[PDB]
Amino acid sequence: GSTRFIKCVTVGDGAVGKTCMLICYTSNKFPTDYIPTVFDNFSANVSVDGSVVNLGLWDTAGLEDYSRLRPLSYRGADVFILSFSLISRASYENVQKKWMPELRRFAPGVPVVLVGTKLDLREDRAYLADHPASSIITTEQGEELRKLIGAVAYIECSSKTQRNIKAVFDTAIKVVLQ
Numbered sequence: 001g002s003t004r005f006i007k008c009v010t011v012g013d014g015a016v017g018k019t020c021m022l023i024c025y026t027s028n029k030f031p032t033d034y035i036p037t038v039f040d041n042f043s044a045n046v047s048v049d050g051s052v053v054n055l056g057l058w059d060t061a062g063l064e065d066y067s068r069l070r071p072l073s074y075r076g077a078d079v080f081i082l083s084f085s086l087i088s089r090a091s092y093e094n095v096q097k098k099w100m101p102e103l104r105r106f107a108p109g110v111p112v113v114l115v116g117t118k119l120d121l122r123e124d125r126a127y128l129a130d131h132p133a134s135s136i137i138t139t140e141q142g143e144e145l146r147k148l149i150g151a152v153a154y155i156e157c158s159s160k161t162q163r164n165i166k167a168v169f170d171t172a173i174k175v176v177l178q
C-alpha cells in the first residue's frame with residue numbers, strides 16, 4: 001500500500017567486488033566461485049531505524065563494453081553505491097575521473113554511498129608485503145575521497161570476511177529516508 005521501494009544501483013570499476021557484495025548481503029557468506037558478472041538482488045521489509053522498506057539492487061558490470069548500457073540503469077534510481085577497491089589506487093582515481101562525473105551527468109542530486117571494498121586485503125600482511133604501499137587506500141584517504149566527490153556516506157567492507165556488509169545497504173536506505 002505504502003511500503004517504499006528503493007532502486008539502488010551499484011557501480012564502480014571491473015573486479016572491485018560489486019557482485020560479491022550484493023550476493024553476500026542476502027546470503028551472509030562469501031561466494032568463492034561461479035561469480036556471474038551481474039547478480040541483481042532484493043531484500044524485503046528491511047528495517048532501518050524502525051522504518052521498513054523494499055530495497056531493489058541493480059548490479060552493473062564495470063566492463064568498458066557495457067558503458068552505454070549503464071546510463072539506462074541509472075534512470076529512475078534512488079541511490080547509488082559507488083565502489084572502488086581499497087587495494088587499488090587506480091579504482092580510487094576512477095571514482096573521481098570516471099564514475100562520479102557520469103552519475104552527476106545522468107542522475108544529478110541522487111545520493112551516492114561511496115564504498116571501499118576488499119577491506120580484508122588492506123589488513124592482510126602478505127598482501128601488503130607484496131604490493132606497493134601506494135596502491136593501498138587508508139580510511140583517511142577514503143573519507144577524503146567521500147568529501148571531494150560529494151558522496152553522502154562512506155563505508156569500508158569485506159565480502160570475504162563479512163565486515164560492514166549490512167552497513168553498506170543500511171546506509172543506502174538511510175540516505176534515502178533521512
Ligand SMILES: Nc1nc2c(ncn2[C@@H]2O[C@H](COP(=O)(O)OP(=O)(O)NP(=O)(O)O)[C@@H](O)[C@H]2O)c(=O)[nH]1
Nearest residue numbers: 014015016017018019020037061062118158159160
Ligand atoms: N579478498 C577479497 N576478494 C574479493 C572481495 N569481494 C570480491 N572479491 C574478489 O574480487 C573479484 C571480483 O569480484 P566481483 O564481485 O566479481 O567484482 P565485480 O565488481 O562484480 N566485477 P564486474 O565489474 O566485472 O562485474 C573476485 O576474484 C572475488 O573473489 C573481498 O571482500 N575480499
Ligand SMILES: [Mg+2]
Nearest residue numbers: 018019037038
Ligand atoms: Mg559483477
